Design an enzyme around this catalytic site. Structure first.
Site, PDB file in Angstrom:
ATOM      1  N   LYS A  58       0.798  -1.129  -0.063  1.00 15.68           N
ATOM      2  CA  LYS A  58      -0.035   0.023  -0.020  1.00 15.68           C
ATOM      3  C   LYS A  58       1.061   0.628  -0.725  1.00 15.68           C
ATOM      4  CE  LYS A  58      -3.072   0.910   3.422  1.00 15.68           C
ATOM      5  NZ  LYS A  58      -4.233   2.026   3.872  1.00 15.68           N
ATOM      6  N   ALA A  78      -3.631 -33.483   7.280  1.00 17.10           N
ATOM      7  CA  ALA A  78      -4.857 -34.044   8.061  1.00 17.10           C
ATOM      8  C   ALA A  78      -6.400 -33.254   7.914  1.00 17.10           C
ATOM      9  CB  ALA A  78      -4.217 -33.469   9.623  1.00 17.10           C
ATOM     10  N   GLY A  79      -7.318 -33.885   8.698  1.00 21.43           N
ATOM     11  CA  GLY A  79      -8.909 -33.786   8.239  1.00 21.43           C
ATOM     12  C   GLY A  79      -9.479 -34.108   7.158  1.00 21.43           C
ATOM     13  N   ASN A 126      15.927  -9.570  -0.120  1.00 19.68           N
ATOM     14  CA  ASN A 126      15.223  -8.171  -0.635  1.00 19.68           C
ATOM     15  C   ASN A 126      14.933  -8.502  -1.707  1.00 19.68           C
ATOM     16  OD1 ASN A 126      17.713  -6.698  -1.219  1.00 19.68           O
ATOM     17  ND2 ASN A 126      16.335  -5.340  -1.350  1.00 19.68           N
ATOM     18  N   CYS A 153      16.207  -6.472  -4.925  1.00 16.83           N
ATOM     19  CA  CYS A 153      17.288  -6.441  -5.067  1.00 16.83           C
ATOM     20  C   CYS A 153      18.470  -6.607  -4.946  1.00 16.83           C
ATOM     21  CB  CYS A 153      17.706  -4.968  -5.327  1.00 16.83           C
ATOM     22  SG  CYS A 153      15.851  -3.645  -6.025  1.00 16.83           S
ATOM     23  N   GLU A 196      20.630  -7.001  -2.009  1.00 19.29           N
ATOM     24  CA  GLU A 196      21.298  -6.356  -0.913  1.00 19.29           C
ATOM     25  C   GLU A 196      21.340  -5.933   0.393  1.00 19.29           C
ATOM     26  OE1 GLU A 196      18.530  -2.464  -2.019  1.00 19.29           O
ATOM     27  OE2 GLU A 196      18.567  -4.791  -2.350  1.00 19.29           O
ATOM     28  N   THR A 253      17.564   6.801  -9.069  1.00 26.07           N
ATOM     29  CA  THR A 253      17.630   8.630  -7.858  1.00 26.07           C
ATOM     30  C   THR A 253      19.648   9.033  -8.484  1.00 26.07           C
ATOM     31  OG1 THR A 253      18.825   6.226  -6.111  1.00 26.07           O
ATOM     32  CG2 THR A 253      18.073   7.875  -5.808  1.00 26.07           C
TER      33      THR A 253
HETATM   34  N1  LIG Z   1      -8.134 -26.524   1.002  1.00 28.84           N
HETATM   35  C1  LIG Z   1      -7.298 -26.370   0.874  1.00 28.84           C
HETATM   36  N2  LIG Z   1      -6.523 -25.922  -0.534  1.00 28.84           N
HETATM   37  C2  LIG Z   1      -6.032 -26.072  -0.842  1.00 28.84           C
HETATM   38  N3  LIG Z   1      -4.369 -26.260  -0.375  1.00 28.84           N
HETATM   39  C3  LIG Z   1      -5.087 -26.373   1.241  1.00 28.84           C
HETATM   40  C4  LIG Z   1      -5.534 -26.518   1.751  1.00 28.84           C
HETATM   41  N4  LIG Z   1      -5.996 -27.041   3.478  1.00 28.84           N
HETATM   42  C5  LIG Z   1      -4.792 -27.079   3.404  1.00 28.84           C
HETATM   43  N5  LIG Z   1      -3.949 -27.208   2.176  1.00 28.84           N
HETATM   44  C6  LIG Z   1      -2.877 -26.847   2.709  1.00 28.84           C
HETATM   45  O1  LIG Z   1      -1.915 -27.754   3.513  1.00 28.84           O
HETATM   46  C7  LIG Z   1      -2.141 -26.338   3.554  1.00 28.84           C
HETATM   47  C8  LIG Z   1      -1.459 -26.585   5.281  1.00 28.84           C
HETATM   48  O2  LIG Z   1      -3.398 -26.806   6.050  1.00 28.84           O
HETATM   49  P1  LIG Z   1      -3.236 -26.617   6.896  1.00 28.84           P
HETATM   50  O3  LIG Z   1      -5.157 -25.972   6.413  1.00 28.84           O
HETATM   51  O4  LIG Z   1      -2.771 -25.412   8.199  1.00 28.84           O
HETATM   52  O5  LIG Z   1      -3.746 -26.773   9.010  1.00 28.84           O
HETATM   53  P2  LIG Z   1      -5.190 -28.799   8.582  1.00 28.84           P
HETATM   54  O6  LIG Z   1      -5.655 -28.341   7.350  1.00 28.84           O
HETATM   55  O7  LIG Z   1      -4.960 -28.481   9.856  1.00 28.84           O
HETATM   56  N6  LIG Z   1      -3.723 -29.754   8.150  1.00 28.84           N
HETATM   57  P3  LIG Z   1      -2.009 -29.902   8.908  1.00 28.84           P
HETATM   58  O8  LIG Z   1      -0.906 -28.971   8.761  1.00 28.84           O
HETATM   59  O9  LIG Z   1      -1.837 -30.908   7.801  1.00 28.84           O
HETATM   60  O10 LIG Z   1      -3.020 -30.157  10.625  1.00 28.84           O
HETATM   61  C9  LIG Z   1      -1.279 -24.980   3.322  1.00 28.84           C
HETATM   62  O11 LIG Z   1      -0.436 -25.472   2.908  1.00 28.84           O
HETATM   63  C10 LIG Z   1      -2.403 -25.224   1.527  1.00 28.84           C
HETATM   64  O12 LIG Z   1      -1.187 -25.597   1.225  1.00 28.84           O
HETATM   65  N1  LIG Z   2      -2.699   1.169  -2.418  1.00 33.27           N
HETATM   66  C1  LIG Z   2      -3.688   0.336  -3.224  1.00 33.27           C
HETATM   67  N2  LIG Z   2      -4.146   0.401  -4.660  1.00 33.27           N
HETATM   68  C2  LIG Z   2      -5.236  -0.948  -4.395  1.00 33.27           C
HETATM   69  N3  LIG Z   2      -6.798   0.390  -4.848  1.00 33.27           N
HETATM   70  C3  LIG Z   2      -6.469   1.016  -3.202  1.00 33.27           C
HETATM   71  C4  LIG Z   2      -4.994   0.900  -2.882  1.00 33.27           C
HETATM   72  N4  LIG Z   2      -5.275   1.705  -1.399  1.00 33.27           N
HETATM   73  C5  LIG Z   2      -6.926   1.769  -0.875  1.00 33.27           C
HETATM   74  N5  LIG Z   2      -7.293   1.246  -2.329  1.00 33.27           N
HETATM   75  C6  LIG Z   2      -9.301   1.441  -2.290  1.00 33.27           C
HETATM   76  O1  LIG Z   2      -9.225   1.843  -1.090  1.00 33.27           O
HETATM   77  C7  LIG Z   2      -9.545   1.285   0.259  1.00 33.27           C
HETATM   78  C8  LIG Z   2      -9.530   1.747   1.267  1.00 33.27           C
HETATM   79  O2  LIG Z   2      -8.472   2.931   1.770  1.00 33.27           O
HETATM   80  P1  LIG Z   2      -7.941   1.892   2.991  1.00 33.27           P
HETATM   81  O3  LIG Z   2      -6.752   1.504   2.527  1.00 33.27           O
HETATM   82  O4  LIG Z   2      -9.347   1.717   3.857  1.00 33.27           O
HETATM   83  O5  LIG Z   2      -7.550   3.081   3.939  1.00 33.27           O
HETATM   84  P2  LIG Z   2      -6.755   4.786   3.728  1.00 33.27           P
HETATM   85  O6  LIG Z   2      -5.642   3.933   2.279  1.00 33.27           O
HETATM   86  O7  LIG Z   2      -7.038   4.956   4.917  1.00 33.27           O
HETATM   87  N6  LIG Z   2      -7.481   5.923   2.464  1.00 33.27           N
HETATM   88  P3  LIG Z   2      -9.644   6.563   3.268  1.00 33.27           P
HETATM   89  O8  LIG Z   2      -9.833   4.862   3.822  1.00 33.27           O
HETATM   90  O9  LIG Z   2      -9.857   6.691   2.056  1.00 33.27           O
HETATM   91  O10 LIG Z   2      -8.860   7.381   4.430  1.00 33.27           O
HETATM   92  C9  LIG Z   2     -10.165   0.616  -0.556  1.00 33.27           C
HETATM   93  O11 LIG Z   2     -11.400  -0.202  -0.740  1.00 33.27           O
HETATM   94  C10 LIG Z   2     -10.009   0.333  -1.736  1.00 33.27           C
HETATM   95  O12 LIG Z   2     -10.514  -0.069  -2.868  1.00 33.27           O
HETATM   96  N1  LIG Z   3      11.460  -0.580  -9.190  1.00 28.63           N
HETATM   97  C1  LIG Z   3      11.887  -0.486  -8.118  1.00 28.63           C
HETATM   98  C2  LIG Z   3      12.639  -0.621  -7.774  1.00 28.63           C
HETATM   99  C3  LIG Z   3      13.019  -1.075  -6.410  1.00 28.63           C
HETATM  100  N2  LIG Z   3      12.513  -0.911  -5.002  1.00 28.63           N
HETATM  101  C4  LIG Z   3      12.696  -0.930  -4.016  1.00 28.63           C
HETATM  102  O1  LIG Z   3      13.598   0.007  -3.349  1.00 28.63           O
HETATM  103  C5  LIG Z   3      14.940  -0.285  -2.750  1.00 28.63           C
HETATM  104  C6  LIG Z   3      15.828   0.501  -3.401  1.00 28.63           C
HETATM  105  O2  LIG Z   3      16.688  -0.058  -4.241  1.00 28.63           O
HETATM  106  P1  LIG Z   3      17.178   1.667  -5.807  1.00 28.63           P
HETATM  107  O3  LIG Z   3      18.477   1.194  -5.784  1.00 28.63           O
HETATM  108  O4  LIG Z   3      15.770   1.050  -7.066  1.00 28.63           O
HETATM  109  O5  LIG Z   3      16.898   2.676  -5.019  1.00 28.63           O
HETATM  110  P2  LIG Z   3      15.343   3.873  -5.737  1.00 28.63           P
HETATM  111  O6  LIG Z   3      14.413   2.864  -6.887  1.00 28.63           O
HETATM  112  O7  LIG Z   3      14.554   3.869  -4.454  1.00 28.63           O
HETATM  113  O8  LIG Z   3      15.884   5.072  -6.309  1.00 28.63           O
HETATM  114  C7  LIG Z   3      14.876  -1.784  -3.578  1.00 28.63           C
HETATM  115  O9  LIG Z   3      16.065  -2.608  -2.768  1.00 28.63           O
HETATM  116  C8  LIG Z   3      13.480  -2.460  -3.294  1.00 28.63           C
HETATM  117  O10 LIG Z   3      13.300  -2.819  -2.277  1.00 28.63           O
HETATM  118  C9  LIG Z   3      11.146  -1.054  -6.033  1.00 28.63           C
HETATM  119  O11 LIG Z   3       9.899  -1.271  -5.115  1.00 28.63           O
HETATM  120  N3  LIG Z   3      10.863  -0.894  -7.317  1.00 28.63           N
END
Ligand SMILES: Nc1ncnc2c1ncn2[C@@H]1O[C@@H](COP(=O)(O)OP(=O)(O)NP(=O)(O)O)[C@@H](O)[C@H]1O
Ligand SMILES: Nc1ncnc2c1ncn2[C@@H]1O[C@@H](COP(=O)(O)OP(=O)(O)NP(=O)(O)O)[C@@H](O)[C@H]1O
Ligand SMILES: Nc1ccn([C@@H]2O[C@H](COP(=O)(O)OP(=O)(O)O)[C@@H](O)[C@H]2O)c(=O)n1
Ligand SMILES: Nc1ccn([C@@H]2O[C@H](COP(=O)(O)OP(=O)(O)O)[C@@H](O)[C@H]2O)c(=O)n1
Ligand SMILES: [Mg+2]
Ligand SMILES: [Mg+2]
EC number: 1.17.4.1
Lengths: 659, 659
Positions: free
Chosen positions: B164, B184-185, B347, B349, B351, B532
């Site tokens: 965001k 499991a389950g 990260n 890039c 670094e 930059t």
């Molecule tokens: N309904 C589902 N659809 C797709 N992938 C699933 C689903 N349920 C579990 N997975 C896969 O397995 C998940 C791990 O299971 P999770 O939901 O954390 O706990 P659980 O259902 O209690 N089973 P387990 O983790 O084996 O005890 C995620 O890593 C998913 O990749």
């Molecule tokens: N980075 C984003 N990318 C796409 N949609 C966004 C983004 N940020 C906000 N929105 C849209 O607006 C959002 C509402 O904003 P939200 O993130 O809840 O609070 P906020 O950023 O504090 N702005 P506001 O709600 O106007 O005070 C969601 O309904 C999204 O549809």
């Molecule tokens: N195109 C890009 C490049 C970098 N980045 C992020 O911003 C950091 C800044 O690296 P950078 O050398 O590109 O510096 P600036 O792009 O901030 O000038 C990177 O290490 C990434 O974490 C990004 O979000 N989008």
């Protein structure tokens, strides 16, 4: 049949020994113990094994047909290493205990009735009752937590956790700001509903349902005033750019009366972002129109012609059979939950009408009664009657059953548990309505069938209210009963301003409800019965047959009759495939048969809606009104919506099926 | 230029009046007050307006070039109704106050140095310093919270909230179970990484960065033993089915030494699901090989030929320039954060080398020094020298700057604030390395350039450690300093087992660190400097020029020299476009020029890695080693990876660019 015999061979007979097998099961490829019965249910079986094993009647596995039985093997019966370990009677017995716990008396009563095909529980219950994570619910009604990235992603986590188990999702989104809306803290603009719907679509595809081979799918609910409306209704279209569609989700309109008046009047319709018109979704009827008209006069939105929107909706439905139509005001004016606040959506099949909020996610447990099983000749001669007294008796069992499920249920999310323990809504339904009419030799569109429809539903609603009342006397009313229509003595047909048909004593029942309350905020919501009707071998639901045909096996009641008139040659077998399951315009078939075996495409939709209207006055919630159109036209579809809308219906249209 | 003059016309001059304009701003289309300065910074300006307004020197707006200035207008300077309201000096002054708050002395010192182009802060800081939601950080290192649907979706919420705002995401996923794993389950099986990566890809597309016109993008980190490895490396491929790709994300390998030995030895490599081989990611080096070899002997995984995997990785890189390569063991053996636990990713890039866990999300603030600005003739004649003393002096300013940002920063998530307030990592870098060599007339691959590289980096690391030490004396060491390599007197080059070059007094510095500690767990991480470097008008980073050309404007230092030799005709202008920015094989250009203006595609990659190796001993963290290949071959790419791997490098390869 051969298939049932082959099961009896490749499976252990003794129920207690099958429960041992299942409970002790270990995943060979992993070494992890993977028990398929719970501690609770295992211990119950072992302390009652003689009583239980001897109660099972294995004849009753031949109560099912080929398509019925193969449904059970393919997905319902429990498996040990891909191989089937459960018999149909074992599944049923597991379900009986899973519902009733230590009440072995009740368990046996449920068992007998289920094994005899009087009724059945919804698929989630069949899958999971008696098992360690027993998630027995079909319906989730989920509130969009708030108009924020945090809100949206919490909401998205909740849908995934719910989708992890059985049951579909109704999700309302009326509070998300539309395309181009202002966002505080950035020069960025909002992208609106569609990109956000694509995120929910993706989660839908990733989280498989119960690990099934399902279509995982949510229905989304929106009010036609939302500025993102045109795209939203087109979400299932076959063409256009992939970035604007969401083919695994279902759009549903939550329509206020005012939208319809304005269409009928050829008037104007105004569109808002919820950030510019706050509160629209949190009110209805008169209060909605006071608030909407004001915002409309205050220039806050974008006005266009109502019929422009209307025409666009009718396109989407003709091509894709969606958006579903549910009337917001009819749902709210006539809910026994109106004391909780404003209802904002329905469910995935447009039958559940329940309240939901960010901290309360509505849930519902489902069961359906088999209507044909109450037909008897019981008179003297051969004229068949319908035993309403056994129906009343059985619907009291299903109500008590579904009431136990609420307490023995595993809830995927805390919002669901809070919601269900508070209001305890319940959902009874029916299957085999068409079969019933056919067996009693009543054309679907007769004055006799019309009267039977009403009577059947009057008795189910009465029974359920009665059982729920008896339950209230035992455990107390549900938490939120004070201030409800039911607490004020106002039942469902009263909210339709109609006297009941009067086959039962409503006065005494009402007296008792006001005195002791009821256990369940809601009781009745006839559902689509897709897979459960195949298991019992009946027509779905309360609709009529789609064809008399359906490796293609002809209608049993029609076949019987064609042979009795000794006219069943190869000429019949081919003209039936030729006309795909229609018997009209066949030279040598008597008129009584043509009227009896009319296909849904041949019955008038005014008649279909009339019967929905009629029975609707005994429905706490709503029902999944599928609509069928032969040669569809704009005006033809228009008069159906308006007709049902004026009839006072809540669900105006579930799917729209065509040619 | 014309463009700078046109700004001075369409903008107010007085800084205090521009801050008024911005702070008082109201969104006309909405009525909401949308202030672009914070209470804090507004009040500071108004209580010092005479001091501040008079300190701004507007000549310095002509320090920028056309491509430089137009970057600022297009995205950096603040806007009032699409129109530009800030001058470059106003942006800088805002940044100065935004960092330093009430320390007007420091604010003026930062201002002067920044306006004179000694250094600059990373884009997030330029965007947001001085504004109400000041998110000044570039780097987020995020742990996958757990192998669960709840874990995955919490993690997904965190990435959206981070996206965001400014700054990219490094996300490690070594703990998610691979395709076909037991759950499991349910009888359901796991679908593995790819479908889950598609979910993260979707969120990437939905949440725009700061509301920008960006590519929002995460880098994902995985260990080559993971059973889902082949698909993971192919995630950016141009062909194949859309369901198996994720084109907005970057795959990165977290490679243990053992993988490389086994490839060099033509041995076997075994693949696991993390549920079958727990702990592999939470250890390294000797302990990893003890645990891995054991699981390998215990049949828990799937063995194939190491070189099969190796060959597949080299395909992915030749086609897509990814996966990035970072050496897990080199990163861990040589981190000053090793006392916190095992480092699991880098990260976006490649670094940042920082520790991260489900409850601690690593953050880093970035700034870069302009190397050319410390060149002077200062001797007597005309032979230019490099002022190392001003460089030391300036790198102490940047360290103190970046140390203030940590405290004045808005953190998108609680995991980031916990992490940064504890370890306070910091990241200095450089730009204009190629320009420096060119101005001092040193071919990139000379013994003189080699010596300059080392000296420059020795002074930056020393300065930063010194400033950070002085800071520790004022505020105390960072929370987790006890038990660190630095606390035991072990600096970075010591962990490479090397004496420093010795241009500075390391003995005294080490003495003081052990006595008082340091404020920052880490200090140095040379980053790609993409935008930059364009603003200041220098070559990116520490790489050499990609071409001498680049509506196409020729290298300034080359042009100067071609005119001085009076050979700059149209023949030069066309042969430069013809050979795209290469001057070799040109008949009339002196050898000294051909050696000086060698393009990166003409410098040997052994030389490039040598210099990375050399300077690396003064780098707390790592650096973004871009690799360039003329006519690529499997073996050619193989010997680069192994060469840098044996050199002890942490980041073996960031991008791979070709022909
Ligand atoms: N309904 C589902 N659809 C797709 N992938 C699933 C689903 N349920 C579990 N997975 C896969 O397995 C998940 C791990 O299971 P999770 O939901 O954390 O706990 P659980 O259902 O209690 N089973 P387990 O983790 O084996 O005890 C995620 O890593 C998913 O990749
Ligand atoms: N980075 C984003 N990318 C796409 N949609 C966004 C983004 N940020 C906000 N929105 C849209 O607006 C959002 C509402 O904003 P939200 O993130 O809840 O609070 P906020 O950023 O504090 N702005 P506001 O709600 O106007 O005070 C969601 O309904 C999204 O549809
Ligand atoms: N195109 C890009 C490049 C970098 N980045 C992020 O911003 C950091 C800044 O690296 P950078 O050398 O590109 O510096 P600036 O792009 O901030 O000038 C990177 O290490 C990434 O974490 C990004 O979000 N989008
Ligand atoms: N194909 C389907 C159909 C229904 N459902 C959900 O399960 C509920 C049960 O409705 P139904 O009439 O289809 O009954 P069964 O499919 O459980 O036999 C529906 O109301 C939906 O909430 C689903 O998840 N997938
Ligand atoms: Mg908000
Ligand atoms: Mg789990």
């Amino acid at each position: 049949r051969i298939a049932i015999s082959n099961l009896h061979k490749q499976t252990t007979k003794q129920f207690s020994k099958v429960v041992e097998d299942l409970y002790r099961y270990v995943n060979a490829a992993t070494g992890k113990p993977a028990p398929m019965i719970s501690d609770d249910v295992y211990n119950i079986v072992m302390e009652n094994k003689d009583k239980l094993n001897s109660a099972i009647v294995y004849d009753r596995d031949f109560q099912y047909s080929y398509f019925g039985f193969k449904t059970l093997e393919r997905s319902y019966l429990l498996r040990i290493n891909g191989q089937v370990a459960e018999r149909p009677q074992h599944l049923i017995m597991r379900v009986a205990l899973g519902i009733h716990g230590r009440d072995i008396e009740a368990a046996l009563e449920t068992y007998n009735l289920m094994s005899l095909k009087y009724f059945t529980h919804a698929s989630p219950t069949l899958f999971n009752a008696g098992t360690p994570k027993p998630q027995m619910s079909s319906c989730f009604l989920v509130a969009m937590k708030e108009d924020s990235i945090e809100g949206i992603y919490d909401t998205l986590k909740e849908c995934a956790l719910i989708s992890k188990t059985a049951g579909g999702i109704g999700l309302h989104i009326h509070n998300i700001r539309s395309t181009g809306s202002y966002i505080a803290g950035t020069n960025g603009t909002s992208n609106g509903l569609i990109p956000m719907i694509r995120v929910f679509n993706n989660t839908a595809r990733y989280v498989d349902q119960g690990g099934n081979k399902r279509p995982g799918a949510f229905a989304l609910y929106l009010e036609p005033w939302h500025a993102d409306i045109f795209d939203f209704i087109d979400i299932r279209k076959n063409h256009g750019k992939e970035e604007i569609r969401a083919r695994d989700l279902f759009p549903a309109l939550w329509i206020p009366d005012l939208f319809m008046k304005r269409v009928e009047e050829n008037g104007t319709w105004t569109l808002f972002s919820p950030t510019s018109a706050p509160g629209l979704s949190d009110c209805y009827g008169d209060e909605f129109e006071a608030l909407y008209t004001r915002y409309e006069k205050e220039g806050r939105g974008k006005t266009i012609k109502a019929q422009k929107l209307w025409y666009s909706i009718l396109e989407a439905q003709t091509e894709t059979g969606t958006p579903f139509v549910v009337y917001k005001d009819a749902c709210n004016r006539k809910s026994n939950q109106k004391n909780l606040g404003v209802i904002k959506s329905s469910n995935l099949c447009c039958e559940i009408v329940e309240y939901s909020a960010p901290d309360e996610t509505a849930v519902c447990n489902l069961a359906s009664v088999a209507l044909p099983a109450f037909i008897e000749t019981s008179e003297d001669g051969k004229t068949s009657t319908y035993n309403f007294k056994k129906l009343h008796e059985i619907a009291k069992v299903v109500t008590r059953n579904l009431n136990r499920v609420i307490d023995r249920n595993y809830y995927p999310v805390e919002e669901a548990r809070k919601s269900n323990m508070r209001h305890r809504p319940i959902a009874l339904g029916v299957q085999g309505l068409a079969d019933t009419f056919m067996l009693l030799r009543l054309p679907f569109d007769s004055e006799e069938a019309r009267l039977l429809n009403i009577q059947i539903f009057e008795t189910i609603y009465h029974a359920s209210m009665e059982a729920s009342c008896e339950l209230a006397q035992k455990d107390g009313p549900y938490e939120t009963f004070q201030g409800s229509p039911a607490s004020q003595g106002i039942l469902q047909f009263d909210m339709w301003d109609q006297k009941p048909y009067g086959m039962w004593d409503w006065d005494t029942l009402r007296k008792d409800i006001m005195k002791h309350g009821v256990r369940n905020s809601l009781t009745m919501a006839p559902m689509p019965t897709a897979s459960t009707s195949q298991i019992l071998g009946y027509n779905e639901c309360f609709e009529p047959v789609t064809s008399n045909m359906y490796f293609q096996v002809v209608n049993p009641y029609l076949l019987r009759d064609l042979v009795d008139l000794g006219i069943w040659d190869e000429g019949m077998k081919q003209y039936l495939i030729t006309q795909n399951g229609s018997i009209q315009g066949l030279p040598n078939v008597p008129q009584e048969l043509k009227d009896l075996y009319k296909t849904v495409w041949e019955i008038s939709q005014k008649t279909i809606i009339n019967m929905a209207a009629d029975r609707s006055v005994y429905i706490d919630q709503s029902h999944s009104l599928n609509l069928f159109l032969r040669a569809p036209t704009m005006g033809k579809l228009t008069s159906m919506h308006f007709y049902g809308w004026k009839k006072g219906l809540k669900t105006g249209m579930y799917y729209l099926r065509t040619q």
